[PDB]
Structure formats: structure tokens, C-alpha cells
Write a protein that binds this ligand. Structure first.
Ligand code: QHW
Length: 289
């Protein structure tokens, strides 16, 4: 009990510093301490009850600064603190956590499309590079299942991708997995039960409402019910056995919609709206502040 869905950063006209937290048990939103630097295209994660904001970019009227930053929010103090920075700026990043360590995957720095990957150790406050992906990927979706890390879709500098790959930590090695049925860049990627879900994204022509899941045992991708709204650059997380998708861009509007997927019924419902429409947020779940 007592866990909230935290959304950090995002973009609407410029990158945003908002940190807001949604309580599924009562429908309420809380506005919390702003990020120290506005950022969109970041990712969020939680280790040890602390919320981390990783990478992104400050897209402002005065220009664009890609972020190498790692910042930590403590709900017990409602305070952000800087951590050690990554080796390189990473906008449009994906992150996953394996056994208490944060993996920062891919992303962009200006016209550079990264294949590099690095791993953060919170107890030592240090980053170190690990093996790079087989493919350069920006707008990559990342999730962890059974202590294996998956990098899904994205854009390699020339094409949006249906490909995906898995990192095997004990071998420090990446291997391709079955490609998705749909090209997806800027999708929401998460884990639920024994599958990696990829929701939404941009296929090179339209923002998508389709959702597909990779069963790590059978190596197949299967479509599930589509979202009500097409969305790219959506936030995503899992909480109490359901997927939540937050915001994004539908080709017309920066959405405030939050939808929730129930795997038992294979249906999506609208559960709340964010306080303002935005895309490119980081999202994670931890205890209330
Ligand atoms: C529409 C729009 C306009 C602006 C100015 C911004 C900042 C944004 S954003 O904040 O959410 N965003 C950060 C950024 O683009 O710098 C951002 C965040 C995550 C992923 C991506 N991503 N990666 C590759 C591709 C691709 O098209 O293949 C995309 C697009 C989402 C499909 C982008 C948005 C949407």
C-alpha cells in the first residue's frame, strides 16, 4: 500500500520541470518539488525507494541542451539531489534496473545516435560503460524481466526500427530477439507477467495506438487490445498488475490522457487526466511523499 505513479519532466512548448504523482487508490494528483533543470526525453526509475531522473534534454526558447544528468528524488524529504553524471548526454533515452543497478541505454546527443550503454551503482555513486547494443537506438524502449534487459525499437539515424535485443548481464553481451510486428520509435515499453509490452510509438508515418507483447519463453510478439489514443513519446509504468500510459503526442495534441490496461480482460480504460498535456515524461512508482 501507499505507492504512487510519479511523472517527471516532459514537454509542452518547452521542456518542463514538473514532478507530479498520481494515487490510483483515490484519483488524486500531487504537485511535488520541481526538477532542478527542465527536461523532456528522460526516463525515470526507482531503486531503494528513491526516484531517479535520467538523461533527456532541456528544449527551451534559448536552445537545446542534451542531458548527461542523473538526479535523485527522495519522497521522504520532497527534495532532488544530483548524482554522478553519465559518460555522455542521452536524450530520448531508455532505462532499466537490474538488481539495484540502473542501465542507461542508447539515446541521442545532437546528431549522434548512441549504441552505448552504461550502468550506475547507487552505493558507490558511479557509472561505468558496459557492452554497447548491436544497433544504435534513440527513442528506445527498455524494460527488465527475469534479470534480463530488453531494448525495443527506436530510430538508428536512418530508419525507425521494429528490431529488439536483449542484454545478458553475466555475459556482458547483447543478442537480437524476434522483431516486433510494427516499427515503433518513442513507444512505451514495460514488463507485465512474462511479457515485454510495447505500446504506441511512431512508425515513420503515424503515431500508433497498437500494443504488442513479447513472451520471453515463446519468443513471439502478439497484439493485445489497442489503446484508445494513438500516442508517441508516452510515459508508461506498471502498478498492481496493470499498465498505465501517460500523455504523449497523438499527431494533433500533447495528451493529458492516462489509460490503464487490465490484462485479465484485455481492455484499456481512461483512469485520470494529467494536470496538463505533455509528452516525453519519465515515469516510475514508489512510496508516497
Ligand atoms: C512531437 C514532439 C516535439 C518536441 C519538440 C519534443 C521535445 C517532443 S518529446 O519531448 O516528447 N521528445 C524529446 C525530443 O524529441 O527531444 C521525445 C521523447 C521520447 C522519444 C522521442 N523520439 N525518439 C525518436 C522518435 C522518432 O520520431 O523516431 C521520437 C518521437 C516520439 C516519436 C522524442 C515531441 C514528442
Amino acid at each position: 500500500v501507499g505507492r504512487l505513479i510519479y511523472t517527471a519532466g516532459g514537454y509542452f512548448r518547452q521542456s518542463l520541470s514538473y514532478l507530479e504523482a498520481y494515487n490510483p487508490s483515490n484519483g488524486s494528483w500531487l504537485r511535488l518539488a520541481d526538477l532542478q533543470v527542465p527536461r523532456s526525453g528522460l526516463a525515470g526509475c526507482v531503486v531503494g525507494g528513491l526516484l531517479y531522473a535520467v538523461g533527456g534534454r532541456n528544449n527551451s526558447p534559448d536552445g537545446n541542451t542534451d542531458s548527461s544528468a542523473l538526479d535523485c528524488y527522495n519522497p521522504m524529504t520532497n527534495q532532488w539531489s544530483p548524482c554522478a553524471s553519465m559518460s555522455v548526454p542521452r536524450n530520448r533515452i531508455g532505462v532499466g534496473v537490474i538488481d539495484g543497478h540502473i542501465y542507461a541505454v542508447g539515446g541521442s546527443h545532437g546528431c549522434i545516435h548512441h549504441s552505448s550503454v552504461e550502468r550506475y551503482e547507487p552505493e558507490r555513486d558511479e557509472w561505468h560503460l558496459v557492452a554497447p547494443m548491436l544497433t544504435r537506438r534513440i527513442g528506445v524502449g527498455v524494460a527488465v524481466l527475469n534479470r534480463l534487459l530488453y531494448a525495443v525499437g527506436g530510430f538508428d539515424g536512418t530508419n525507425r526500427l521494429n528490431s529488439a535485443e536483449c542484454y545478458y548481464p553475466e555475459r556482458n553481451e547483447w543478442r537480437m530477439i524476434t522483431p516486433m510486428n510494427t516499427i515503433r520509435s518513442g513507444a512505451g515499453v514495460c514488463v507485465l507477467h512474462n511479457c515485454i509490452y510495447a505500446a504506441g510509438g511512431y512508425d515513420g508515418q503515424d503515431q500508433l495506438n497498437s500494443v504488442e507483447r513479447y513472451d520471453v519463453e515463446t519468443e513471439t510478439w502478439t497484439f493485445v487490445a489497442p489503446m484508445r489514443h494513438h500516442r508517441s513519446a508516452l510515459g508508461i509504468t506498471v502498478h498492481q498488475g496493470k499498465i498505465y500510459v501517460l500523455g504523449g503526442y497523438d499527431g494533433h495534441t500533447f495528451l493529458d490522457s492516462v489509460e490503464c490496461y487490465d490484462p485479465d480482460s484485455d481492455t484499456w480504460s481512461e483512469v485520470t487526466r494529467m494536470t496538463s498535456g505533455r509528452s516525453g515524461v519519465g515515469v516510475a512508482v514508489t512510496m508516497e511523499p
